[PDB]
Nucleic acid binder design. Structure first.
Length: 48
DNA sequence: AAAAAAAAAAAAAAAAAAAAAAAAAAAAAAAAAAAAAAAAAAAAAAAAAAAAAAAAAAAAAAAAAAAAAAAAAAAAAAAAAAAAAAAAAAAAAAAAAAAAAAAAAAAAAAAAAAAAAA
């Protein structure tokens, strides 16, 4: 589950992951996302 | 686009380490008595020096313990086999100076934003 929320005032968007798959570690997922951002694999991640 | 290797799921096998608390011993590093050793003073037994002397090597010569000869017999030591102790020769090594790659601070300047003036 992953929506794309947009604030009323500013146009900047955010992705909110409500749920994750089965037998997936949340900490390892976040570490993988951070590694992808540091290695410039994924483009457009402002924060995490 | 093919090959190869990591990693993660869950039941299995098998291990490892840090501290507290008291009382005794064992290493290991220091002050501090205590005695060799060394520098620099005065001080005092020994060599010198000389005259004077008498105790032991020479010399005669007998004789009595001796070192070579003979014999028998016992068996220490030497050289050849093996089997251990203990030391130079040579090579290896762990920290350790040298080099190279990544993290944090820096401001110049502008995009976007927030806020307010007339």
């Amino acid at each position: 589950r992953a929506e794309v929320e947009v604030d009323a005032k500013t146009g900047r968007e955010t992705i909110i992951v409500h749920e994750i798959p089965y037998q997936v570690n949340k900490a390892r997922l976040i570490e993988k996302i951070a590694e992808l951002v540091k290695e410039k694999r994924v483009e457009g991640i402002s924060a995490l």
